[model samples]
Target: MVLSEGEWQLVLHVWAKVEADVAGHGQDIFIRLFKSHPETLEKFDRFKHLKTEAEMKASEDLKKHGVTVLTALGAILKKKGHHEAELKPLAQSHATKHKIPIKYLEFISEAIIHVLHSRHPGNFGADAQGAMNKALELFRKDIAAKYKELGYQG
Candidate 1:
C-alpha cells in the first residue's frame, strides 16, 4: 500500500524521535523494531544483537546511519520545497544491506513510528509532521541519486 504524504511524514517524524530516544537510552532499537516487524529479523546479522559492547556499538552505528539519511532527506526537502516523493529505493538499499525485501522497510518505518508515538506523543505533533514530510521528500531524492550512481533503475 502506498502511503500518503501525510502518512509518510508521520512515519518519518516518529522515526527521528525514536532514533534519538533509542540512542540516548543506549538500548536496542533493533529489538523494538524487530518485535513489531518480526520478519525483519532475518535481514540483519545475528551478531547485531550479541548483548556485548561490540553489539551495542554496532547498534549505535546503525542509529547514526539512520539519522544521517533522515537528516539529509529533511535538508533536501527544505531546499526543494516538496512535500512527498517515493522513497522505495532508499528502502531498497537498506533492504539490500540487511538482506531483506524492500517491502519490509515500510514495516520498519511503521514500527519505529509506533514506538515514537507511544514514548513521546508530544514530539509527534503537527509541526513534527511538516518537518518529517520535508525530510521524506529529500530522502526520496537521495535514494534516486544513489540508484543513479549505482546504475540501477529507480
Candidate 2:
C-alpha cells in the first residue's frame, strides 16, 4: 500500500476536514452516539450532558491526537508491511473495555471512508483505496500498542 505524496496530501486534507466537522458537531455526534447506543453511555463519563469550553478544548486535543496517530500510521505503513492482523485484536480489546462491540471498528472505518469519499468526489481512486488500507493497517498497530501500554488485554 504505497502512497504518492499527492495521495498522502489528500488523506491529510480529508482528515483535517473531518476533524473540523467533528469539532463543530462534537455535541451532536455525542448525542447521536448515545441515542443510538444508550446502553453504552453508562460506561463513559457523565459529562456528555454538559457543554463547556473545556469540552471544546478536549475535542481539539483528541483531534490532534487522532491526527498524530494517523500521520504516524502513514509513516509506519510506508516503512513496514501489513499491520491490520495485529491491530484487530487490540481494537477488539479496547472496545470490550468500553463495552462497545468490536464490530464498531468496521463501522467507524466505513464512516471515515464515506466521509472522505463524499468530500473528495472522484479524487478517491484505486490508489487512494490502497493508501487507506495501508494507513488503516498501521493505525490498528499503533492502537494495539497504545492498548498494551495501558495494560488493556482481551
Candidate 3:
C-alpha cells in the first residue's frame, strides 16, 4: 500500500488547500473527529469542556493542537513518504509525554479521510482515499510502536 506518484499528487493537492487554512481547519478536524466518535472526547482533558458546538467554537485547545497536527502532516506529505523521523517521533512524544490515547492518533487519520472526501468532493476517489488511509494507518502503527518501545503501554 505504498503511495504512488498520482496518489501522492492527489494528497498534496488536497493538502495544499488544507495548508491554506491549516490553523483554522485544525479545530474543525478535531471537532469532526469528536463528532464521528463521541467516545473519544472523554479521553482528553484539554478539550473536556468542549462538548457542545458552542463550547467547541470557544476553545483554543482545539486550535493549538489542530494546527500542530496539520503542520506535522504537511511535513510528511512534503517528503512523499520518507517522513518517519518527522512523523513517528511526534507519536512517540504524544504517547510517552502527553498520554494521548492511541485512538486519537487513529482518529486524526480517520477524520482526515472524511475531510479529504468532503473537502474536494469527487476529486479524491476510492484509490486516493485508500492510499491516504494506508499512509496514515502506517503512521498510527509506527507511532504506537515507538510509544511501546519507550515503555509506554498502549
Candidate 4:
C-alpha cells in the first residue's frame, strides 16, 4: 500500500533533514540496528570484522555501506509505488543469498526512525512519525511479499 499525498509530504519533510548527512544518519541507524539485533551484523561480510562499538563507528566500510543503504531508502521513498520491480531481485537476494531475515527490515526501519528522531527532533512530530511508520511498513510488506513468492521462508 502507498502512503497518502499528505503522508508522503510529511515523511519527506522530515527526510530532507536526514538527507543533509545521509552517511552519519545511516551509520547511526545501522549501529542502532546491530546493537538491538547483533545477529543482523553477522550477515554483512564487510562488517563481520567489526568487533567493538569503536570499530563499527570508525569503519570506512561501515560508512560507505550506510550511505548505500540510505541512498536506496531515499530512492524508494521518493518513487513510492514504482519500486516493486526493483525490489524483486532485492527480496530474492536477501532471502536466499544474503540469508537476511525479513525482520531485519523491520529492525532497520525502526533504527532509521530512531536516528531521525534523535537527530532532528524539531522536524519529527507525531504526524511525521506516523507517516514514516506507514512508509517503512509499506516497504517491508512489499519486500516480504516478494520473499514469499520466492518460497524463501524468513
Candidate 1: worst-modelled 10 consecutive residues by lDDT: 77-86
Candidate 3 accuracy as TM-score: 0.84
Give stretches of model 2 more than 4 Å off. Answer: 1-7, 16-103
Model 3 clash pairs are none
C-alpha TM-scores of all predictions: 0.47, 0.45, 0.84, 0.94
What is candidate 4's TM-score against the reference? 0.94
- lDDT (tens digit, per residue) of candidate 1 on 1-154: 2345666556555655555654542234445565665556555574335454455456656666555644544444443334334344444555355344335544554554455556777877766654554454445445545555555542
What is the RMSD, in Å, between candidate 4 and the native fold over all Cα?
1.2
Residue pairs that clash (backbone atoms under 3 angstroms), model 1: 74-135
Candidate number that wins on TM-score, 2 or 3 = 3
* Cα lDDT for residue 35, candidate 2: 50
| Global lDDT of each candidate | 0.51, 0.51, 0.76, 0.86
Reference-based lDDT, residue 121, model 4:
76
Give the Å error, residue 76, model 2: 12
Give the C-alpha miss distance for residue 52 in model 2, angstroms.
Answer: 24
RMSD of each: 6.8, 7.0, 2.1, 1.2
